[PDB]
């Protein structure tokens, strides 16, 4: 069982743009 | 008896038609309601008379 | 019957009341809010 | 009339230009009474004109001859039309009344007094004269009580109105011993609006209907005397907004409510809206499907009590959600049906299979015109029944049509109530034309975060 | 509620109260049971309602036990309106046999844990042989559905696709249980009865029963389980 | 498309109900002046409202 | 149908329902004739 | 006013200083909507399979019973119910209540009350902020649509089972069986609604473009063009005369929308009245008035049935009705 | 899962089967170049409709 | 693993909505 | 099992009573305007 | 038929009466 390809695809599509948006947010708030 | 009722109803249609085309014009006429009082009373009395005539002619027709 | 059911579905129950305790607590809650509002009316 | 720059309102708001002109209000209102009575008389004349006497009277596209026929005016024992003269005389009297009403309306709009209280204190009113508003409510409520007692006079003393529940298929019956008791009348008005009972669409018998009319006439007359002889209370004057615009909002919300109610009345009732004169409702013609099929296959030779359908419940019978036996079609959503041809087939506990086998009546059997055609399908463009049915018959059910017209127009009146509710509240506050641009409530109170 | 007072109630009073689901009882009768006069009877109105619904399940350790359940079905479980006969002698042997009526009921029940078990509560084609105290027999059990019933893929028995419409590359010797068999062979069940509260004047017997019948086989894909039904029945002798 | 119809309706209604006084006639459409440089609606009031 | 004494007037009857709809349309003519004042 | 418990309660409920204004419409909006949200989430996660059709042949519609979110849905009540009001206390068990279809009745009833009280809450904030109140009037179109597909259609067809399921695949199924038995796509109100949603998107893009183009330079390609002046001045930005000039030069410059109030009223009224009309079309077919039935409409001299686009749609609609309720029909005509 | 279990179904499954119905009953005259003279017993139905 | 994925994305988006509603940047310029 | 019904009926009448007396309780004067 | 001819002449008489009234009030003074 378990669709590991879909699990990986969904997991990276969450984490990588989320980390991208959060890193620009925290670096923007670090130096306003 | 049917012909009398039919002629009375036709006259009532024409009288009501005259009242419809005349009452708003005469009312909204500048200084017209105080001068056409006689003809409006005549038209209304005739209208009511033909209504009552058709009513009493239904029972014989 | 195989189970205990309320068996009040339909039958023309006013406000869906089937036992008197429910009507009494409805009237009690409305009267409680009414007493609070009346004693605390006129703002002050 | 008057112009915009002095009234403040554009042409598409011009009927509000006469808010403070009671005489023009009277002219517009009497003219509207003329319009309503004119449509009533005209349509009664058409429905007289387009009549086919041999057919049942619901396939001719007639909406209000059922209104006269529900009063029993020219109705046979089984439901035969017999005569059309009462419908004709009703239409003509309405037309003459329309002419006199319209003449009075145009007179008060044009040459009638521009403002009423300077010559007629009895007829003039500012919209804060709460005592005289209550007097007007008293007058109108006395009128409504008189109309209800008029229906009382017809039902008990003039020998009219059709009961669909008389044995053999109904009869026009002079109602003796109407049920006026407060327990049944109030339990009829305070129950649930769903299929278990139905709130206001639940009146199964005309003694119950006429007893409710006793109650409404007595209550309206006594409340009319009350409203005439009393003054508004401080709690009412604080909670309510008193202006002509707020009064519109109250009237609009109320009339939308009774419009929604009238829609449901037309959709479900077969008692105050006779199926023989209106066509079948939703649950019937489907109860008629199941009934005709059960009698037909028990006629051929196949049993129905041991007959089992495709899904395990029964093709022709099953048990209801409550322990009673109900019809086995897809009409099992309509097990709460009550129509004049099922009570002689209705047993206390079950459907009385031996009664179904033997005690079947041929009026019940011949009640198949509701089944075959006339179901409350009918499309926007007539045609037959379901959306796939082809151009074979010209029919639509007046129940459907004066249900949907009424509910749509009641929804629009709910919207009008919302509009004038908000505008009346904002105008009584003082900002109907907007915020004052220099001292806003926004800048006076705290920021959110 | 004895049948005599049930007929005197209007159709509105019973509506929504569930007393139509309740079978009539006997209060004026006797419990002598063997007192009933022998001969041939042609009785009518078999009333039959359940009181419990317990389902047999098989553990993988080797013992026989039952367990109570919770009904998903509402008040559609009683049997009402049959007719039949028994041939009674002086000693007590009977020849009970139903003929025709509402001899089935669609019912759905779940075991603890949450497994759907629908069944058709049938009593049809029941032969009754034995004494009044305890007489049993066998009754025909239909499948549940007609052969025209459709699965959500549209396949079926008498009508349907009977092939893998959803996926075209699966028709091997694996879907035989799901596609090829589609069995509706009717099973058989055993119901043991007992006659209690006999009436002498008008001939009314109203006892209890315990019926073993198999559950639904659905489409024959999975084997049926046994369901025992305990309840009370009623009948009027003529 | 449903969000676009949403935005069109909500924006039109919000502007129409924040139109300020801008006159003494109750017809607010004539209360607008194409010459004036002030906003026709209170976006502060609109923002705190939503 | 109409009775025998009123049968010839049925075509004159047969044009009435549009008149209330013509009333609001007449109001539109009124409002255009006063040039939308 | 300050030592009075009810006066304190009123001045907190009607306080516009809160993060979310609640008011007297909010004290009845919040519990119904929160209840509906809670039971909707719990049912969408772990709803046991529910029999929608009254034929003891249920659908799952829940994630923990083996489907994804778009194919999973809160499913309408049983056909055994109809409009029969089945809440938890009408069931001997939560389990039987779930199988019968009660959570749909609960979410739909609570969502109806919550949406109407959201209408009222929006009007209430408009009043307490000193505005004009017609936000609720513009909001009346989604409210009318929600009532039409959750209450009006169950009333008209006699059963909550015919109502719109809370889902996406369920939405498509209800929508398609609605096509099959009512022919909405050939109805003037639905054409007005489609014209209105397309026009609402059109006017949204048009207004957005005409006023984002009409920009006096205060925000450059940087975050803003504050070099002229920083934040804190009443010198207003943007333009509205040039937008009307561009729209006038666009086609014929006579149906002038020069007044910004007239323009925004038109953008407010067009999609609202069109969604009003399409919701009323749903309401008309609740009382089962359908749309245009243009089948068998074109014939030749010999009277032969001459095929038409309407006949194409008709055969599609009847091919839709044949799978509609495969086993829940025992009888030929579909009325119940 | 709907193939291995005749008990599982969704509104999605209903929609797929309904799409098959649309295809079968409409393409017959919608695509005249295909000469689709498919008889009525291969065209699929429900019960009673 | 299928169902918890859907549950997590749904409740996560609802969490972002909650956080944006109550813990947003306070609004400036009108 | 009717205990759930009693509890929910009580809380429903409580919320409805808050609504009824809240709008009975001089609601139109809860306005910043001169009215 | 004669029924259709009467229907049409009655139709024309009832549709042309209103504009006749407004034109007569426009040419016979005003106060409309
Ligand atoms: C700007 C400028 C102005 C623009 C205005 C735009 C707005 C409206 C324009 C007019 C609207 C009607 C246009 C079509 C008129 C028509 O083709 O006329 C239609 C009919 C046609 O007359 C006859 O209609 C009959 C229809 O069958 C009827 O009669 C049959 C028996 O003969 C059966 O009894 C059947 O049940 C019954 O429906 C037959 O088809 C005849 O062949 C046909 O001649 O006439 C009629 O009714 C007359 C129409 C009356 C209007 C009824 C309004 C309904 C009100 C509320 C319901 C709302 C519903 C909402 C959803 C929709
Ligand atoms: C229900 C329909 C209806 C009714 C009864 C009224 C009634 C009235 N309106 Mg009004 N109006 C309506 C619809 C209606 N309106 C609509 C739809 C609009 C939007 C276009 C308007 C816009 C409007 C404006 C802008 C104004 C009014 C005004 C008025 C008032 C005076 C009109 C007047 O004196 O000028 C006279 C009207 C005419 C000369 C044209 C009508 C022709 C005659 C009078 C009627 C038709 C003839 C008929 C057959 C006569 C019956 C005769 C009888 C014997 C049978 C009046 C009481 C005015 C007002 O508010 O008062 C201050 C005003 O300025 N209305
Ligand atoms: C349509 C006609 C009509 C109208 C417009 C009014 C209007 C009014 N009446 Mg009145 N009244 C009427 C008919 C009417 N009445 C009749 C026929 C009677 C005789 C029974 C009375 C007897 C009456 C009395 C004794 C009083 C009023 C009062 C009032 C005023 C206060 C309203 C109020 O109490 O708030 C709203 C009321 C409530 C929120 C509580 C009502 C209780 C419930 C709703 C009724 C129970 C029935 C049932 C449970 C409701 C469910 C069904 C419903 C959803 C349809 C108000 C202006 C008061 C007054 O005179 O002011 C000085 C007053 O005390 N009326
Ligand atoms: C409660 C209102 C109501 C109801 C329930 C009915 C019901 C009925 N009417 Mg009737 N009618 C009404 C009002 C009503 N009418 C009014 C006010 C008029 C005066 C114009 C007429 C004039 C009329 C005639 C002449 C006839 C009927 C006929 C009929 C019957 C069949 C309908 C038909 O044949 O074609 C159906 C007609 C339509 C589907 C047209 C729909 C028009 C829509 C609703 C207009 C609104 C659309 C949209 C919102 C407009 C937006 C733009 C706007 C800004 C202008 C039917 C039972 C026929 C009949 O059998 O004779 C008795 C027929 O001959 N009616
Ligand atoms: C284009 C507008 C339009 C049209 C054409 C209609 C048309 C119609 N409506 Mg309607 N309505 C409308 C708008 C419209 N409505 C709107 C906007 C609303 C608000 C949402 C309503 C709300 C409404 C309701 C609540 C009802 C109707 C009803 C009706 C039908 C009967 C009318 C009636 O008898 O009223 C009533 C007339 C009066 C109240 C005044 C007369 C008083 C009575 C008749 C006196 C009693 C006399 C007696 C019975 C006979 C004399 C006998 C002798 C011994 C004295 C009719 C076909 C009724 C219905 O659904 O059909 C049953 C109904 O109950 N409408
Ligand atoms: C009996 C109920 C009633 C009454 C007495 C009034 C009275 C009034 N309204 Mg009002 N209104 C109502 C119901 C009512 N309304 C409803 C139900 C709605 C929702 C649609 C509205 C929405 C509304 C708005 C938005 C406005 C008013 C306004 C006004 C004021 C000026 C009206 C005017 O001159 O406009 C002129 C009249 C016309 C232009 C005629 C309109 C023609 C319509 C649109 C065509 C449709 C007719 C068609 C045959 C019906 C189709 C069937 C239907 C199912 C769609 C006036 C005092 C104005 C105001 O606020 O003034 C303070 C205003 O802005 N009303
Ligand atoms: C807006 C448009 C309105 C249009 C139409 C509205 C029509 C009718 C509305 C009232 C009809 C019913 C009157 C009350 C009777 C009733 O509800 O019985 C109560 C019913 C009955 O409840 C059930 O009844 C059954 C037998 O009838 C059984 O007994 C069940 O056990 C029982 O639960 O339950 C309800 O309907 C719930 C009512 C909840 C009301 C909350 C409203 C709060 C919102 C606003 C408050 C404003 C003031
Ligand atoms: C099965 C049958 C069901 C159907 C019968 C239902 C009967 C319902 C009749 C209620 C009518 C009351 C109208 C008041 C409207 C609000 C006026 C107001 O703004 O009122 C406020 C106003 C402001 O001065 O004052 C006033 O006019 C005072 C008026 C309010 C009167 C107080 C209510 C009675 C109080 C009884 C207390 C119940 C106590 C709890 C009992 C618990 C038992 C254990
Ligand atoms: C005839 C008839 C009958 C009878 C009926 C009746 C008797 C009725 C009634 C009724 C009633 C007896 C009613 C009453 C009512 C009331 C109401 C309906 C109300 C209200 C109101 C409101 C809604 C409010 C609001 C508010 C608030 C909340 C508070 C403050 C103020 C305000 C306004 C804000 C019957 C069915 C039997 C039969 C058939 C027919
Ligand atoms: C003010 C105004 C207005 C309104 C108006 C109106 C509303 C009017 C009316 C009116 C009316 C409301 C009318 C009615 C009427 C009626 C008539 C006029 C009648 C009659 C009669 C006759 C003559 C008949 C006969 C007959 C018979 C008897 C039966 C048989 C057949 C016949 C038909 C032959 C408008 C909006 C415009 C504008 C604004 C202002
Ligand atoms: C043509 C014809 C006929 C005949 C008829 C006659 C010979 C008579 C009549 C009739 C009549 C004769 C009707 C009526 C109407 C009436 C009315 C419509 C009334 C009224 C009144 C009022 C409306 C009042 C008001 C007021 C005042 C002013 C004072 C104080 C306040 C009040 C509001 C109370 C018939 C149908 C048989 C048949 C067919 C043909
Ligand atoms: O459940 Mn919902 O959808 Ca009104 O149609 Mn009959 O049921 Mn069933 O089918 Mn088609
Ligand atoms: Cl069926
Ligand atoms: Cl489906
Ligand atoms: Fe803008
Ligand atoms: Na089928």
PDB file of N, CA and C in Angstrom, chain E residues 138-172:
ATOM      1  N   UNK E 138     -38.892 -25.221   8.935  1.00  0.00           N
ATOM      2  CA  UNK E 138     -38.015 -24.474   8.050  1.00  0.00           C
ATOM      3  C   UNK E 138     -38.851 -23.539   7.188  1.00  0.00           C
ATOM      4  N   UNK E 139     -38.273 -22.385   6.863  1.00  0.00           N
ATOM      5  CA  UNK E 139     -38.927 -21.390   6.031  1.00  0.00           C
ATOM      6  C   UNK E 139     -37.968 -20.942   4.936  1.00  0.00           C
ATOM      7  N   UNK E 140     -38.522 -20.650   3.759  1.00  0.00           N
ATOM      8  CA  UNK E 140     -37.719 -20.181   2.637  1.00  0.00           C
ATOM      9  C   UNK E 140     -37.172 -18.793   2.929  1.00  0.00           C
ATOM     10  N   UNK E 141     -35.906 -18.580   2.595  1.00  0.00           N
ATOM     11  CA  UNK E 141     -35.237 -17.300   2.766  1.00  0.00           C
ATOM     12  C   UNK E 141     -34.835 -16.797   1.386  1.00  0.00           C
ATOM     13  N   UNK E 142     -35.446 -15.720   0.874  1.00  0.00           N
ATOM     14  CA  UNK E 142     -34.957 -15.117  -0.375  1.00  0.00           C
ATOM     15  C   UNK E 142     -33.584 -14.492  -0.191  1.00  0.00           C
ATOM     16  N   UNK E 143     -32.946 -14.074  -1.285  1.00  0.00           N
ATOM     17  CA  UNK E 143     -31.612 -13.491  -1.197  1.00  0.00           C
ATOM     18  C   UNK E 143     -31.628 -12.204  -0.381  1.00  0.00           C
ATOM     19  N   UNK E 144     -32.270 -11.164  -0.933  1.00  0.00           N
ATOM     20  CA  UNK E 144     -32.451  -9.825  -0.369  1.00  0.00           C
ATOM     21  C   UNK E 144     -32.955  -8.911  -1.474  1.00  0.00           C
ATOM     22  N   UNK E 145     -32.217  -8.886  -2.577  1.00  0.00           N
ATOM     23  CA  UNK E 145     -32.495  -8.032  -3.717  1.00  0.00           C
ATOM     24  C   UNK E 145     -33.072  -8.863  -4.853  1.00  0.00           C
ATOM     25  N   UNK E 146     -33.742  -8.189  -5.774  1.00  0.00           N
ATOM     26  CA  UNK E 146     -34.105  -8.828  -7.016  1.00  0.00           C
ATOM     27  C   UNK E 146     -32.888  -8.987  -7.902  1.00  0.00           C
ATOM     28  N   UNK E 147     -33.033  -9.822  -8.930  1.00  0.00           N
ATOM     29  CA  UNK E 147     -31.937 -10.004  -9.873  1.00  0.00           C
ATOM     30  C   UNK E 147     -31.734  -8.793 -10.773  1.00  0.00           C
ATOM     31  N   UNK E 148     -32.660  -7.837 -10.754  1.00  0.00           N
ATOM     32  CA  UNK E 148     -32.540  -6.596 -11.505  1.00  0.00           C
ATOM     33  C   UNK E 148     -31.854  -5.490 -10.718  1.00  0.00           C
ATOM     34  N   UNK E 149     -31.356  -5.784  -9.523  1.00  0.00           N
ATOM     35  CA  UNK E 149     -30.659  -4.796  -8.712  1.00  0.00           C
ATOM     36  C   UNK E 149     -29.288  -4.496  -9.309  1.00  0.00           C
ATOM     37  N   UNK E 150     -28.874  -3.232  -9.246  1.00  0.00           N
ATOM     38  CA  UNK E 150     -27.615  -2.795  -9.833  1.00  0.00           C
ATOM     39  C   UNK E 150     -26.613  -2.369  -8.767  1.00  0.00           C
ATOM     40  N   UNK E 151     -25.388  -2.858  -8.917  1.00  0.00           N
ATOM     41  CA  UNK E 151     -24.236  -2.410  -8.149  1.00  0.00           C
ATOM     42  C   UNK E 151     -23.810  -1.034  -8.675  1.00  0.00           C
ATOM     43  N   UNK E 152     -23.000  -0.254  -7.932  1.00  0.00           N
ATOM     44  CA  UNK E 152     -22.718   1.114  -8.410  1.00  0.00           C
ATOM     45  C   UNK E 152     -21.892   1.190  -9.684  1.00  0.00           C
ATOM     46  N   UNK E 153     -21.271   0.092 -10.105  1.00  0.00           N
ATOM     47  CA  UNK E 153     -20.612   0.024 -11.401  1.00  0.00           C
ATOM     48  C   UNK E 153     -21.590  -0.256 -12.533  1.00  0.00           C
ATOM     49  N   UNK E 154     -22.862  -0.489 -12.215  1.00  0.00           N
ATOM     50  CA  UNK E 154     -23.863  -0.777 -13.215  1.00  0.00           C
ATOM     51  C   UNK E 154     -23.968  -2.233 -13.602  1.00  0.00           C
ATOM     52  N   UNK E 155     -23.085  -3.085 -13.091  1.00  0.00           N
ATOM     53  CA  UNK E 155     -23.126  -4.507 -13.388  1.00  0.00           C
ATOM     54  C   UNK E 155     -24.277  -5.164 -12.629  1.00  0.00           C
ATOM     55  N   UNK E 156     -24.465  -6.453 -12.862  1.00  0.00           N
ATOM     56  CA  UNK E 156     -25.507  -7.148 -12.144  1.00  0.00           C
ATOM     57  C   UNK E 156     -25.707  -8.571 -12.602  1.00  0.00           C
ATOM     58  N   UNK E 157     -26.907  -9.071 -12.319  1.00  0.00           N
ATOM     59  CA  UNK E 157     -27.316 -10.432 -12.605  1.00  0.00           C
ATOM     60  C   UNK E 157     -28.174 -10.516 -13.847  1.00  0.00           C
ATOM     61  N   UNK E 158     -29.500 -10.510 -13.655  1.00  0.00           N
ATOM     62  CA  UNK E 158     -30.429 -10.546 -14.782  1.00  0.00           C
ATOM     63  C   UNK E 158     -30.215  -9.373 -15.729  1.00  0.00           C
ATOM     64  N   UNK E 159     -29.882  -8.203 -15.194  1.00  0.00           N
ATOM     65  CA  UNK E 159     -29.552  -7.047 -16.011  1.00  0.00           C
ATOM     66  C   UNK E 159     -28.253  -6.432 -15.516  1.00  0.00           C
ATOM     67  N   UNK E 160     -27.574  -5.730 -16.405  1.00  0.00           N
ATOM     68  CA  UNK E 160     -26.352  -5.053 -16.043  1.00  0.00           C
ATOM     69  C   UNK E 160     -25.275  -5.315 -17.074  1.00  0.00           C
ATOM     70  N   UNK E 161     -24.034  -5.108 -16.642  1.00  0.00           N
ATOM     71  CA  UNK E 161     -22.872  -5.269 -17.504  1.00  0.00           C
ATOM     72  C   UNK E 161     -22.162  -6.600 -17.322  1.00  0.00           C
ATOM     73  N   UNK E 162     -22.128  -7.121 -16.088  1.00  0.00           N
ATOM     74  CA  UNK E 162     -21.371  -8.290 -15.627  1.00  0.00           C
ATOM     75  C   UNK E 162     -19.937  -8.318 -16.156  1.00  0.00           C
ATOM     76  N   UNK E 163     -19.339  -7.143 -16.340  1.00  0.00           N
ATOM     77  CA  UNK E 163     -17.976  -7.009 -16.831  1.00  0.00           C
ATOM     78  C   UNK E 163     -17.365  -5.763 -16.210  1.00  0.00           C
ATOM     79  N   UNK E 164     -16.038  -5.685 -16.255  1.00  0.00           N
ATOM     80  CA  UNK E 164     -15.337  -4.552 -15.667  1.00  0.00           C
ATOM     81  C   UNK E 164     -15.390  -3.341 -16.589  1.00  0.00           C
ATOM     82  N   UNK E 165     -16.449  -2.539 -16.457  1.00  0.00           N
ATOM     83  CA  UNK E 165     -16.592  -1.324 -17.255  1.00  0.00           C
ATOM     84  C   UNK E 165     -15.581  -0.268 -16.827  1.00  0.00           C
ATOM     85  N   UNK E 166     -15.329  -0.153 -15.520  1.00  0.00           N
ATOM     86  CA  UNK E 166     -14.435   0.878 -15.004  1.00  0.00           C
ATOM     87  C   UNK E 166     -13.003   0.696 -15.491  1.00  0.00           C
ATOM     88  N   UNK E 167     -12.506  -0.533 -15.502  1.00  0.00           N
ATOM     89  CA  UNK E 167     -11.157  -0.813 -15.976  1.00  0.00           C
ATOM     90  C   UNK E 167     -11.211  -1.948 -16.999  1.00  0.00           C
ATOM     91  N   UNK E 168     -10.874  -1.675 -18.260  1.00  0.00           N
ATOM     92  CA  UNK E 168     -11.083  -2.660 -19.326  1.00  0.00           C
ATOM     93  C   UNK E 168     -10.073  -3.796 -19.367  1.00  0.00           C
ATOM     94  N   UNK E 169      -8.984  -3.729 -18.602  1.00  0.00           N
ATOM     95  CA  UNK E 169      -7.948  -4.753 -18.651  1.00  0.00           C
ATOM     96  C   UNK E 169      -7.970  -5.627 -17.403  1.00  0.00           C
ATOM     97  N   UNK E 170      -9.164  -5.982 -16.928  1.00  0.00           N
ATOM     98  CA  UNK E 170      -9.292  -6.869 -15.770  1.00  0.00           C
ATOM     99  C   UNK E 170     -10.536  -7.732 -15.994  1.00  0.00           C
ATOM    100  N   UNK E 171     -10.324  -8.902 -16.603  1.00  0.00           N
ATOM    101  CA  UNK E 171     -11.396  -9.870 -16.805  1.00  0.00           C
ATOM    102  C   UNK E 171     -10.906 -11.301 -16.605  1.00  0.00           C
ATOM    103  N   UNK E 172      -9.825 -11.493 -15.853  1.00  0.00           N
ATOM    104  CA  UNK E 172      -9.195 -12.799 -15.702  1.00  0.00           C
ATOM    105  C   UNK E 172      -9.945 -13.633 -14.664  1.00  0.00           C
TER     106      UNK E 172
END
